[PDB]
UniProtKB/Swiss-Prot annotation, chain A:
Changing Q189A: Does not affect ability to cleave and inactivate human TRMT1. The chain holds residues 3264 to 3564 of 7096 of the full protein. This is 3C-like proteinase nsp5. 3CL-PRO exists as monomer and homodimer. Only the homodimer shows catalytic activity. Interacts with host FBXO22; this interaction promotes the proteasomal degradation of nsp5. Changing P132H: In strain: Omicron/BA.1, Omicron/BA.2, Omicron/BA.2.12.1, Omicron/BA.2.75, Omicron/BA.4, Omicron/BA.5, Omicron/BQ.1.1, Omicron/XBB.1.5, Omicron/EG.5.1.
Curated annotation (Swiss-Prot), chain B:
It comes from the Viruses. The gene is rep. Residues 4-304 form the Peptidase C30 domain. Cleaves the C-terminus of replicase polyprotein at 11 sites. Recognizes substrates containing the core sequence [ILMVF]-Q-|-[SGACN]. Cleaves and inactivates human TRMT1, preventing tRNA guanine(26)-dimethylation of tRNAs. May cleave human NLRP1 in lung epithelial cells, thereby activating the NLRP1 inflammasome pathway. May cleave human GSDMD, triggering alternative GSDME-mediated epithelial cell death upon activation of the NLRP1 inflammasome, which may enhance the release interleukins 1B, 6, 16 and 18. Also able to bind an ADP-ribose-1''-phosphate (ADRP). Residues 4-304 are cytoplasmic. This is 3C-like proteinase nsp5. Changing Q192A: Does not affect ability to cleave and inactivate human TRMT1. The chain holds residues 3264 to 3564 of 7096 of the full protein.
Length: 301, 304
């Protein structure tokens, strides 16, 4: 018993963090093989960062512009290129601490760990989910530009996120490791705000399934709803609509607890309309939405 | 501001990952901590299921030889050249010093203080989380199976301060353990006899540090114009199962009080009203819950 949210052990990622400096700007880079990955906005001054031509500003930088430092050892840039919003700096030295790794792109509602870094130094690690509005909750004290998000599967690190900027609303925004932004954001000093966030409905249901596996059962009722009717009530409460895909992902938990997905959806619809009336689920008075169905399957199976 | 939307973080775990090993005695398998040429693990690794109600560890240990213990780091078998007991922690000397040994200390923590736990299974790091030593001397840990010997730690200036090792799960869902010198936190014993955690309380000094942090970051809806006496506050607080506040904790919040202009007992009056009215969907620093697992030490350093 006991459901604590956990981040992946960060050691494999710690051995890849470096410090990247262009002019006055300093931020974190990801050193894998003989390439350092970092946000492309490190080559911008105050003049440039309003509507910059990144590819034109980038060719006109040499290789020695870039100050790459890994501990006390300065890595030697022997080439640079751009891939969407990530700058790629090929260096002369392969990282001997390079782990088994992959670049993957995740979907809103999926969870990963972030290794918060400052000036290339790892400061802390936390578990989070990609919000439905494609932002990640976190403060200025939860990593600066170039900190990465990742999952670990087997012994392989799946890099899925790189932090590019902190929005004023206590959330940050970024890209995958191929430079494609998550959400309608641009790497520019312009008026940018996150849309209205919603609650990740499939994750709440995963969490309610976890509560049932830990014998927290008071909220279960004999009723079922339709996917159509559940969605009607869900959106009124700023919950995400549930898709038939989400229903299928929840399949294994339904088979392991005996609670059909639309059976559990009736309990969650009741929770939304009446609250918990002074009760708790898994020890919390609030519904958790940063546990994927697979997070529960790992921890509770 | 700086801490708008702050999430709690564990320390980067890599330095501890390098010290985790698997310790087996007979058919019992759990985690050990490999520092220099010593492996530390719970002493009940030497117990059978029948020993667990009333193990005589001194008796069980003297019947063990160095070759009773199987220590494994990855695919490498470490060879035990000695064993001794320090309180509830078993200490296995091995013939190989851990080349990944970080700079480290053994420290005992008080309730309310925070640290990270590297949850491990079969010597293998599985996950990491940040927590506080609860006032009832337990920690709320992961689902678990065989995470005994997982350690809790702080990192400061690349030196790892080891403060906790997991020993047992109480019937409540919470966990109990020792410092790295083998002394339990709280009144628990490493036996399978009927043990129950006391009624847990909210760490009030940590809540007040959190509310102060919210004020530095411009989140001010919960402040009132009232103040209170320390003993009027403690009368109300304990009725909400909040931990009593001492002059020590008043002093500890002193820097935050000076940085915001809000006297500690002023904030206490604000907290008293929060407990009265409740946060009912309203958020502080982006969190819909009164956080009690962030210490005044961390707030002052993150809000210079
Ligand atoms: C509750 C919100 C902030 N999320 C987290 O706390 N993730 C996290 C995971 C492991 C250790 C510390 C934190």
């Amino acid at each position: 018993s006991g459901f604590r949210k956990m981040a992946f052990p960060s050691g494999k990622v710690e051995g890849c963090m470096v410090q990247v400096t262009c002019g006055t700007t300093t931020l974190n880079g990801l050193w894998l093989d003989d390439v350092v990955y970092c946000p492309r906005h490190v080559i911008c001054t105050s003049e440039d960062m309003l509507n910059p031509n990144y590819e034109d500003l980038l060719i006109r930088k040499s290789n020695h512009n870039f100050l790459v430092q890994a501990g006390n050892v300065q890595l030697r840039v022997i080439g640079h290129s751009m891939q969407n919003c990530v700058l790629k700096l090929k260096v002369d030295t392969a990282n001997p601490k390079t782990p088994k790794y992959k670049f993957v792109r995740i979907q809103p509602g999926q969870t990963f760990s972030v290794l918060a870094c400052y000036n290339g130094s790892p400061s802390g690690v936390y578990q989070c989910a990609m919000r439905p509005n494609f932002t990640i909750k976190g403060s200025f004290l939860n990593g600066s530009c170039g900190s990465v998000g990742f999952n670990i599967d087997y012994d392989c690190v799946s890099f899925c996120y790189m932090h590019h900027m902190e929005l004023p609303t206590g959330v940050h925004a970024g890209t995958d490791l191929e430079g494609n932004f998550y959400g309608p954001f641009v790497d520019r000093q312009t008026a940018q705000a996150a849309g209205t966030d919603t609650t990740i409905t499939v994750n709440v249901l995963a969490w309610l399934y976890a509560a049932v596996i830990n014998g927290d059962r008071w909220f279960l009722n004999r009723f079922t709803t339709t996917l159509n009717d559940f969605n009607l009530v869900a959106m009124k409460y700023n919950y995400e609509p549930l898709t038939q895909d989400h229903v299928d992902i929840l399949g294994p938990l339904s088979a392991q607890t005996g609670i059909a997905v639309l059976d559990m959806c009736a309990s969650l619809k009741e929770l939304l309309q009446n609250g918990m009336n002074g009760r708790t689920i898994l020890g919390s008075a609030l519904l958790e939405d940063e546990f994927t169905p697979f997070d529960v399957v790992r921890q509770c199976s």
